[PDB]
Design a protein around this ligand. Structure first.
Ligand SMILES: *[C@@H]1O[C@H](CO)[C@@H](O[C@@H]2O[C@H](CO)[C@@H](O[C@@H]3O[C@H](CO[C@H]4O[C@H](CO)[C@@H](O)[C@H](O[C@H]5O[C@H](CO)[C@@H](O)[C@H](O)[C@@H]5O)[C@@H]4O)[C@@H](O)[C@H](O[C@H]4O[C@H](CO)[C@@H](O)[C@H](O)[C@@H]4O)[C@@H]3O)[C@H](O)[C@H]2NC(C)=O)[C@H](O)[C@H]1NC(C)=O
Ligand SMILES: *[C@@H]1O[C@H](CO)[C@@H](O[C@@H]2O[C@H](CO)[C@@H](O[C@@H]3O[C@H](CO[C@H]4O[C@H](CO)[C@@H](O)[C@H](O)[C@@H]4O)[C@@H](O)[C@H](O[C@H]4O[C@H](CO)[C@@H](O)[C@H](O)[C@@H]4O)[C@@H]3O)[C@H](O)[C@H]2NC(C)=O)[C@H](O)[C@H]1NC(C)=O
Ligand SMILES: *[C@@H]1O[C@H](CO)[C@@H](O[C@@H]2O[C@H](CO)[C@@H](O[C@@H]3O[C@H](CO[C@H]4O[C@H](CO)[C@@H](O)[C@H](O)[C@@H]4O)[C@@H](O)[C@H](O)[C@@H]3O)[C@H](O)[C@H]2NC(C)=O)[C@H](O)[C@H]1NC(C)=O
Ligand SMILES: *[C@@H]1O[C@H](CO)[C@@H](O[C@@H]2O[C@H](CO)[C@@H](O)[C@H](O)[C@H]2NC(C)=O)[C@H](O)[C@H]1NC(C)=O
Ligand SMILES: *[C@@H]1O[C@H](CO)[C@@H](O[C@@H]2O[C@H](CO)[C@@H](O)[C@H](O)[C@H]2NC(C)=O)[C@H](O)[C@H]1NC(C)=O
Ligand SMILES: *[C@@H]1O[C@H](CO)[C@@H](O[C@@H]2O[C@H](CO)[C@@H](O)[C@H](O)[C@H]2NC(C)=O)[C@H](O)[C@H]1NC(C)=O
Ligand SMILES: *[C@@H]1O[C@H](CO)[C@@H](O[C@@H]2O[C@H](CO)[C@@H](O)[C@H](O)[C@H]2NC(C)=O)[C@H](O)[C@H]1NC(C)=O
Ligand SMILES: *[C@@H]1O[C@H](CO)[C@@H](O[C@@H]2O[C@H](CO)[C@@H](O)[C@H](O)[C@H]2NC(C)=O)[C@H](O)[C@H]1NC(C)=O
Ligand SMILES: *[C@@H]1O[C@H](CO)[C@@H](O[C@@H]2O[C@H](CO)[C@@H](O)[C@H](O)[C@H]2NC(C)=O)[C@H](O)[C@H]1NC(C)=O
Ligand SMILES: *[C@@H]1O[C@H](CO)[C@@H](O[C@@H]2O[C@H](CO)[C@@H](O)[C@H](O)[C@H]2NC(C)=O)[C@H](O)[C@H]1NC(C)=O
Ligand SMILES: *[C@@H]1O[C@H](CO)[C@@H](O)[C@H](O)[C@H]1NC(C)=O
Ligand SMILES: *[C@@H]1O[C@H](CO)[C@@H](O)[C@H](O)[C@H]1NC(C)=O
Ligand SMILES: *[C@@H]1O[C@H](CO)[C@@H](O)[C@H](O)[C@H]1NC(C)=O
Ligand SMILES: *[C@@H]1O[C@H](CO)[C@@H](O)[C@H](O)[C@H]1NC(C)=O
Ligand SMILES: *[C@@H]1O[C@H](CO)[C@@H](O)[C@H](O)[C@H]1NC(C)=O
Ligand SMILES: *[C@@H]1O[C@H](CO)[C@@H](O)[C@H](O)[C@H]1NC(C)=O
Ligand SMILES: *[C@@H]1O[C@H](CO)[C@@H](O)[C@H](O)[C@H]1NC(C)=O
Ligand SMILES: *[C@@H]1O[C@H](CO)[C@@H](O)[C@H](O)[C@H]1NC(C)=O
Ligand SMILES: *[C@@H]1O[C@H](CO)[C@@H](O)[C@H](O)[C@H]1NC(C)=O
Ligand SMILES: *[C@@H]1O[C@H](CO)[C@@H](O)[C@H](O)[C@H]1NC(C)=O
Lengths: 128, 99, 429, 128, 126, 126, 48
């Protein structure tokens, strides 16, 4: 029940790397995973991976494991059940095939069988 | 610095009269409103933004936050004609005289 | 869907409340023998994922500790002797500058019809004029009670514990300022070893700060809020009254003995304190470093001495070996800092007629201590007061600032274990 | 309940000194801070300094530290220990020190909020 | 695991509901100044405990830690799904969202017990 | 209706037996002179309550408001018909007519419980 | 009605010299003595 604002449309060229931000608020940042998902032109949507701000653990698809830098900061607590977090995303071997909109997504629950499910999304960032 | 607007104000009996108070920096909520008449001592109307003092007529009101604060008077009468200071810590405003 | 409420007893949820804490000690005026034995196994349960709101300036443990120590003071002065027959015309002379006196007075004996002309030594701060004629300072205001010379003014570690059904929450944030949401929280049953040190300007024998030196206040922009700065490295202070004093028992009544200062054996010297001018320079440099984070990286930070008040606040007022010192602190706070063996000496005076707190109508005579007094203590905190181009001066007085410097980590909560929540559960017929 | 009674107006030549007393009654003097404000004819209220009567600690405004000294006189009656009477001593009276000096009392018991709820009638000091 | 007293304070309501006997132990024992202040505490601790045991007794939950009742969950109290309560919220969050309606439920849990045994006195009246 | 605390004091025993949780709530909470006189009362209130909860515990009625037992009604205690008790007499009248035999019944309600669970320990001994 | 229940087959170890009832009685009587001398008159003006 909070916002997940992201960075701007930083259009580079192949070969380089791009760092996309995801600043959270309204919810305890360390209580939910941060999924990374992209919808490029040439395919549909593709799941990249999520990272646990509490456990520090990372899980990402084999199609992006050797490309994605996935890190997180530590929350600056606002109230008892609120905080402000930050999640970072990078890609290595960048091409024109990776051109598309990228979003971060807070996990669904804190337990059960749909813990990391991308529930609360951001707004999107246009790549190259 | 404490700045009150307007410095002077033309008023009529029975109107909704209100005066602004601005601050050079973040204050929070501890802003105090005072009424001062010539020859007499000031009178604490409201303290800590919107906590009206006991005995004050219920027509006085207070609102605001950060760097903007208000002093609203609904159904003004012949007793509410004076200069009105707003006080943060030790800096009293210049005031706003009614007539 | 099918959802009926279900009762859960023993859920982790609490409310902010305030109950009457009790004391615990291990093995004095504070009557630490009467507290429950401090448990050798202090259970500290860490509360993972928890974040609690603190406010060391609304904390009630400080308001309870402040009245508990005062209640202990009036309690340990009831069975002691009353020095009201001392309120008599005194014939005082200087002792062979002119600080401690030598007074003689007609005194009641153990027979109600016999007088005696005994003499005693009094400091200047305990007498006022009318051989020259003097009088105890308290006689025109209050009665006086001589402290029982068996109880000790030694700060014994006190542990405040919450009753059953309540709990205390600690704060494991190494950089936790006064207020805000503590990220790392843990629950305790009793506070740590808190020494009830009654001090002034300089927080003595207190607990240090981990990581860097901290500084706290309600509204640091409000100059009427005493700044409670707490060091991370202790600067050592050595104090001593070097006069080899003697105690003289004076039978003032059947079973009533007034303990007087007989005479000085040997040299007459000055009571003073020492701090290392180097360790105090680097400690003032650390304090001055954190003072710019909310005052400006360019504005100057100046240190001056007190600007008025009573002796208990205008000077480093504390206790050493059983006698109450009052140390001039102008030699410590006299430095102006710009945008970018050593020993200091503090001339202390000594007083025996002291009103411990702001108590009106009550005074206490501290009996003299035989021998040569010297005590070694750490100054671990500090109580500043900015002016309002920013200068800071020491001071204090409100003794709850002392307890607040050690009770900032703690907070009292009330456990309410009854929780109602729904599930698809219903009872039979 | 709280009531502050100040002294009469003063007529002093330049360079002289003036004593301003503030009699209090009807509240615990030692638990309420007493401020000192002045107001030149036409100007706004200016703060001179305060004093915490429990021990007498003081703090002044801009420049008043060198010329103003704030003291008090606590009660010693074991039944009437509430009231007190503060004093403001100003040395080196300049002509611009001509103003109406006010004795103020903070409403907060023990704490300080600067919300002055009990004022004296005022003392008009003129330097000419 | 053994988190300890209030260990699952930040855990979900489903995880904490399994560690109830931990907080149940230390609710009555623990995890002349203060002789009258200590006795004042040893009396308060029992009274708070007997009140919580009083409500459990008039709800039919005497001796129960997890107790199912007959009062159906009014969606006006909280219109949250089941899997968004026990696998998401903490017991501290829940006690806030149900702060107002908490007194209504305590009465409904009472007459649902007095009518229940009144029905049982008739069930055994033959 | 909601008569309140002791509301059905003059009502028949059958009517009052439905308003038991009303008087059950205010039995432990409520509907330096007196600091030691108040604490003297806060201790007495708990002791009277725990005695009544002690008898309910040794009769098998712990947690019950209406509790059926095994002791048959001796006609010597009161030779009154059923419909002339619950639809005629008040609970205040009944406590007087059974004033003497009230201590006999409390003992019979005890061994009928200790023999009952002693039989149940044998019922589960296989 | 002083109830004295006999414990058949029971054998208990005693030690009248470690018995705490004596240490409690000893301090109870002394506590009673200092209690019954508080409101009484002080004969200190007799010391003449
Ligand atoms: C404090 O608050 C935090 C944040 O809210 C809580 O952390 C969350 O805990 C829940 C449950 O405890 C987690 O949900 C589970 O997720 C696992 C997925 O983990 C698996 O895959 C991971 C990636 O491959 C991997 O890291 C795991 O491997 C272990 O090693 C890492 C080392 O980094 C270690 O940190 C992990 O903890 C693992 O032990 C693991 O292979 C998922 O499998 C779970 O589902 C199973 O269990 C549930 C019931 O529990 C069942 O319903 C399912 O069907 C399935 O059987 C489960 O969903 C969540 O991921 C955590 N993180 C979040 C939410 O960000 C923490 O528990 C709180 N602690 C306290 C004390 O309050
Ligand atoms: C605080 O003030 C008190 C006064 O109230 C001081 O007490 C007095 O101290 C003086 C010394 O400073 C004492 O005087 C000395 O008395 C000694 C006792 O002798 C007396 O008794 C003998 C009988 O045995 C008589 O014969 C004799 O005449 C005395 O009456 C003497 O021995 C001392 O004599 C010394 O001085 C003389 C002359 O100066 C020399 O010729 C001698 O050789 C010898 O050196 C001296 O007279 C006095 O008795 C004390 N009074 C009381 C009541 O005790 C405290 O000392 C003072 N304390 C401080 C710290 O200032
Ligand atoms: C801050 O804490 C310091 C230590 O925690 C305090 O120092 C303590 O001060 C008291 C009184 O001034 C001392 O108590 C005195 O002890 C001497 C004898 O002690 C020596 O002998 C014993 C043998 O039993 C030995 O164990 C000691 O180590 C000493 O060698 C007595 O003559 C006195 O009557 C009195 O009892 C403490 O000893 C002293 N502790 C230390 C470690 O120095 C200091 O006073 C505190 N400051 C404040 C302001 O409270
Ligand atoms: C006194 O301190 C409080 C808390 O540090 C200040 O209140 C904060 O003000 C900021 C600025 O708008 C807000 O973002 C916070 O939410 C406020 N916190 C609280 C607890 O109120 C307050 O402004 C300060 N007052 C003065 C006069 O400096
Ligand atoms: C103790 O010594 C001081 C220091 O000389 C004396 O103080 C003098 O007191 C007189 C009054 O009798 C003044 O006129 C002097 O100006 C003071 N001098 C100083 C330097 O302060 C004091 O009188 C002496 N007391 C006794 C009892 O002898
Ligand atoms: C008791 O006597 C003392 C004498 O020191 C009085 O205190 C002094 O009073 C005078 C005038 O009243 C002041 O000039 C001094 O500054 C005071 N000195 C101190 C240290 O307070 C005190 O007022 C008297 N008390 C009573 C109740 O009469
Ligand atoms: C004054 O200085 C330090 C505290 O900063 C204390 O000495 C250290 O105490 C800790 C824990 O008590 C020990 O782990 C260190 O080994 C000690 N260091 C040395 C060099 O001895 C000392 O006890 C303090 N004195 C007080 C607080 O009275
Ligand atoms: C302080 O003075 C006392 C005497 O007033 C000294 O006590 C003496 O100590 C020696 C041992 O060195 C004994 O032989 C004497 O009998 C003691 N005299 C008395 C009267 O008890 C004490 O040593 C002195 N202490 C210091 C530090 O100077
Ligand atoms: C305060 O006193 C202590 C002890 O009396 C001093 O510590 C001693 O310092 C010397 C010189 O460095 C060492 O030789 C001793 O071993 C130290 N004593 C102990 C017990 O360790 C300390 O230097 C003094 N500080 C000041 C500022 O006076
Ligand atoms: C504390 O010490 C300082 C000096 O270290 C004292 O300062 C003196 O102040 C008086 C005015 O009251 C001046 O006349 C002196 O010249 C100052 N002396 C020095 C050396 O600067 C100060 O008085 C002392 N505090 C007290 C209460 O006496
Ligand atoms: C990206 O991931 C690598 C993995 O080795 C890590 O070393 C690096 O620190 C990450 N990026 C940044 C900017 O830290
Ligand atoms: C003691 O009383 C006598 C009686 O005249 C007097 O001469 C003497 O000065 C008194 N001494 C003192 C110290 O007051
Ligand atoms: C303590 O830190 C919090 C957040 O970091 C801040 O809001 C608060 O103002 C700080 N305390 C003070 C006295 O500035
Ligand atoms: C403070 O210092 C000044 C000048 O150094 C001095 O006149 C004054 O007496 C000092 N006050 C105290 C209390 O030390
Ligand atoms: C829910 O509660 C309201 C009053 O709060 C009540 O009027 C309504 O009947 C309840 N609904 C259900 C389904 O229990
Ligand atoms: C989930 O919870 C909602 C309440 O927010 C409810 O309306 C819905 O029927 C529930 N669905 C299931 C399958 O339980
Ligand atoms: C409880 O009542 C208060 C009344 O001020 C209201 O503000 C609050 O929202 C209510 N609680 C809930 C969970 O709606
Ligand atoms: C009734 O009670 C008497 C003693 O009061 C007893 O002797 C008799 O057996 C009892 N009768 C029945 C039927 O229980
Ligand atoms: C009615 O009660 C009487 C006791 O007074 C009893 O003898 C009789 O058997 C009862 N009759 C019925 C039908 O219950
Ligand atoms: C109870 O015993 C007394 C003995 O005096 C007797 O008078 C009374 O009638 C008895 N109660 C009943 C209900 O018979």
């Amino acid at each position: 029940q909070g916002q997940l604002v992201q960075s701007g449309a930083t259009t580079t060229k192949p070969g380089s790397s791009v760092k996309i931000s995801c600043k959270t608020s309204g919810y305890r940042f360390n209580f939910y995973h941060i999924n990374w998902i992209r919808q490029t032109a040439g395919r549909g949507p593709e799941w990249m991976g999520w990272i646990s701000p509490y456990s520090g653990d990372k899980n990402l698809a084999p199609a992006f494991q050797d490309r994605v830098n996935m890190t997180t900061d530590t929350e600056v607590p606002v109230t008892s059940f609120t905080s402000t977090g930050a999640a970072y995303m990078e890609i290595r071997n960048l091409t024109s095939d990776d051109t598309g909109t990228y979003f971060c997504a807070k996990g669904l629950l804190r337990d059960g069988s749909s813990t990391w499910l991308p529930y609360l999304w951001g707004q999107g960032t246009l790549l190259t | 610095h404490v700045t009150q607007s307007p410095s002077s104000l033309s008023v009529s009996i029975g109107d909704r009269v209100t005066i602004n108070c601005q601050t050079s920096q973040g204050v929070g909520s501890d802003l105090h409103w005072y009424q001062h008449k010539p020859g007499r001592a000031p009178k604490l109307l409201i303290h800590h933004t919107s906590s009206v003092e006991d005995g004050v007529p219920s027509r006085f009101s207070g609102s605001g936050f950060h760097t903007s604060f208000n002093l609203t008077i609904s159904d003004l009468q012949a007793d509410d004609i004076a200069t009105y200071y707003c006080q943060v810590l030790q800096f009293f405003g210049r005031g706003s005289r009614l007539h | 869907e099918n959802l009926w409420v279900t009762v859960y007893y023993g859920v982790p949820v609490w409310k902010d409340a305030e109950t009457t804490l009790f004391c615990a000690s291990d093995a004095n005026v504070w009557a630490t023998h009467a507290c429950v034995p401090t448990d050798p196994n202090p259970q500290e349960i860490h509360l993972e994922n928890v974040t609690e709101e603190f406010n060391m300036w609304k904390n009630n443990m400080v308001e309870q500790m402040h009245t508990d120590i005062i209640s202990l003071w009036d309690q340990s002065l009831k069975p002691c002797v009353k020095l009201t027959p001392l309120c008599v015309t005194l014939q005082c002379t200087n002792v062979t500058r002119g600080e401690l006196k030598n007074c003689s007075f007609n005194m009641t004996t153990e027979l109600r019809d016999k007088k005696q002309k005994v003499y005693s030594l009094f400091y200047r701060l305990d007498v006022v004029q009318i051989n020259k004629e003097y009088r105890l300072i308290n006689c025109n205001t209050s009665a006086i009670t001589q402290a029982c010379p068996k109880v000790s003014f030694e700060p014994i570690p006190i542990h405040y514990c919450a009753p059953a059904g309540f709990a205390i929450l600690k704060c494991k944030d190494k950089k936790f300022n006064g207020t805000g949401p503590c990220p790392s929280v843990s629950t305790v049953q009793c506070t740590h070893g808190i020494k009830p040190v009654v001090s002034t300007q300089l927080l003595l024998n207190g607990s240090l700060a981990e990581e860097e030196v901290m500084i706290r206040s309600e509204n640091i922009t409000n100059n009427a809020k005493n700044i409670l700065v707490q060091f991370n490295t202790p600067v050592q202070i050595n104090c001593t009254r070097p006069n080899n004093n003697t105690r003289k028992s004076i039978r003032i009544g059947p079973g009533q003995a007034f303990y007087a200062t007989g005479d000085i054996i040997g040299d007459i010297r000055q009571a003073h304190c020492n701090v290392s001018k180097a360790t105090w320079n680097e400690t003032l440099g650390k304090v001055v470093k954190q003072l710019r984070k909310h005052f400006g990286n360019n504005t100057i930070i100046r240190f001056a001495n007190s600007s008025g008040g009573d002796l208990e606040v205008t000077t480093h007022s504390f206790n050493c070996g059983g006698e109450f010192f009052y140390c001039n602190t102008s030699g410590l706070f006299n430095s102006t800092w710009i945008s970018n063996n050593d020993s200091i000496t503090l001339p202390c005076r000594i007083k025996q007629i002291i009103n411990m707190w702001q108590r009106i109508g009550q005074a206490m005579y501290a009996p003299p201590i035989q021998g040569v007094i010297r005590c070694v203590s750490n100054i671990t905190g500090l109580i500043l007061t900015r002016d309002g181009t920013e200068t800071f001066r020491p001071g204090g007085g409100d003794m709850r600032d002392n307890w607040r410097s050690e009770l900032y980590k703690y907070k009292v909560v009330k456990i309410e274990p009854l929780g109602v929540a729904p599930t698809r559960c219903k009872r039979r017929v | 309940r709280a009531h502050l009674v100040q002294s009469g107006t003063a007529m002093k030549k330049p360079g002289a000194s003036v004593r301003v007393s503030c009699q209090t009654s009807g509240y615990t003097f030692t638990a309420h801070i007493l401020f000192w404000f002045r107001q030149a004819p036409g100007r706004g209220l200016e703060w001179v300094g305060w004093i915490k009567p429990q021990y007498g600690a003081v703090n002044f405004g801009g420049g008043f530290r060198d010329r103003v000294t704030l003291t008090r006189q606590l009660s010693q009656d074991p039944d009437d220990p509430d009231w007190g009477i503060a004093y403001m001593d100003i040395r080196g009276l300049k002509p611009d020190d001509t103003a109406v000096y006010y004795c103020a009392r903070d409403r907060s018991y023990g704490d300080s909020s600067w919300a002055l709820d009990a004022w004296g009638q005022g003392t008009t000091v003129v330097v000419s | 695991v053994f988190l300890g007293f209030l260990g699952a304070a930040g855990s979900t309501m489903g995880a904490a509901s399994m560690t109830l006997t931990v907080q149940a132990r230390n609710l009555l024992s623990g995890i002349t100044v203060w002789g009258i202040k200590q006795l004042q505490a040893r009396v308060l601790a029992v009274e708070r405990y007997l009140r919580d045991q009083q409500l459990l007794g008039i709800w039919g939950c005497s001796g129960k830690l997890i107790c199912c009742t007959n009062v159906p969950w009014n969606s006006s109290w909280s219109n949250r799904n089941l899997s968004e309560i026990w696998d998401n919220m903490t017991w501290l969050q829940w006690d806030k969202e149900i702060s107002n309606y908490t007194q209504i439920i305590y009465g409904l849990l009472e007459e649902s017990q007095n009518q229940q045994e009144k029905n049982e006195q008739d069930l055994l009246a033959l």
